[PDB]
Amino acid sequence: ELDRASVQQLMEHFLAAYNEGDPRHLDHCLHPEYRHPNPAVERGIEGMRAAIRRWASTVEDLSLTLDDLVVEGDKAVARMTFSGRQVGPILGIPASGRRFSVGLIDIFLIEDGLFAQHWDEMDLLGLHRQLGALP
Amino acid sequence: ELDRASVQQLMEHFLAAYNEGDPRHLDHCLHPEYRHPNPAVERGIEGMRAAIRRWASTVEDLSLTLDDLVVEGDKAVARMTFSGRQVGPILGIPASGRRFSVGLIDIFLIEDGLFAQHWDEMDLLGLHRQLGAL
């Protein structure tokens, strides 16, 4: 339903939310009834707003960049690179003060012109290794 | 330039290579000059054939399933689940005899009607955890 240019605009807002640590960008790309796949995350867009706030506090010099975008029908696939310096706990890893850079791929479902749900993979093994949690 | 149904057919061959432990299926979906992103892997399709042979010998009941497929132009995105029981060395982990089931997402580049390159992420952390290595 969304044209490709429109999906590109959604992605610009998604990236800006993280890079600027400004959750308001999410209002322009995420569904208010967003369904995070982790049930520990709050239902709706508040769950993703909480993620923005967490990253803003635990990562310095955060950078999220778009390596590739693939769009078909109600699906958008974003391959991205996520980097920064760890200054707070990240996914069970105590604050190391170290740089990291890892890849991820998110697949978004589009509903009502917004991302409503995702499935993802991130190089968490690489993240653990870079942040000194694993040899 | 591949019709979408044609990409689905490529994926059926890709899945069958793993599920049947038969590298010949790769001849019907991978470019002979395949470019694996890992420089440690042999150049061309033999790098991927080697992967089939390895997984087929180290995993019992190997199952590779296609959970979602997104196709646009010369790109095919396959979200998959990789399951089985470890019966040989996997990534330096000695044979544990344990079950595993982990997700991956592969993005394939299509050249000359075949997959010629990929970018991917796979839940290797989860695989290590499930096999008792971490």
Q: Where are the beta strands (DSSP E) in A52-113?
A: 59-72, 75-86, 99-111
Q: What Å distances lie between residue B29 and A91, A122, B34, B113, B115, CA to CA?
A: 37, 26, 10, 8, 6
Spatial contact of A111 and A32, defined as CB atoms under 8 Å apart: no
DSSP letter, residue B22:
-
Domain boundaries, chain B: 1-134
In angstroms and rounded to an integer, the radius of gyration of the C-alpha atoms of chain B is 15
Contacts of residue B25, defined as CB under 8 A and 6 or more positions apart, other chains included, come to B13, B14, B16, B17
**B72 contacts in chain A (CB < 8 Å):** 70-72
Spatial contact of A117 and A76, defined as CB atoms under 8 Å apart: no
Backbone angles phi, psi at B109, to 5 degrees: -95, 130
Least CB–CB distance from B70: residue in A67, A72, A120: A72
Spatial contact of A55 and A17, defined as CB atoms under 8 Å apart: no
- Alpha-carbon torsion angle A24, A50, A74, B71, nearest 10: 110
Backbone angles phi, psi at B64, to 5 degrees: -115, 120
Q: Test B123 with A121 for CB contact under 8 angstroms.
A: yes
Taking the C-alpha atoms of residue A114 and residue A27, their distance in angstroms, rounded to an integer, is 9
> CB-hemisphere CA count at 13 Å for A68?
20
Question: Which residue in A108, A123, A105, A135 sits closest to B123, CA to CA?
Answer: A123
**A104 contacts in chain B (CB < 8 Å):** 121
Residue in chain B closest to A134 (alpha carbons) equals B134
Q: 3-class DSSP state for residue A29? A: coil
Interface probe for A, chosen from B69, B70, B130 (most Cβ of A below 10 Å), is B70
**A83 token code pair:** 């980097």
- In angstroms, what is the resolution? 1.2
C-alpha B43 chain-centroid distance = 16
DSSP letter, residue A38:
S
Method for structure elucidation: X-ray
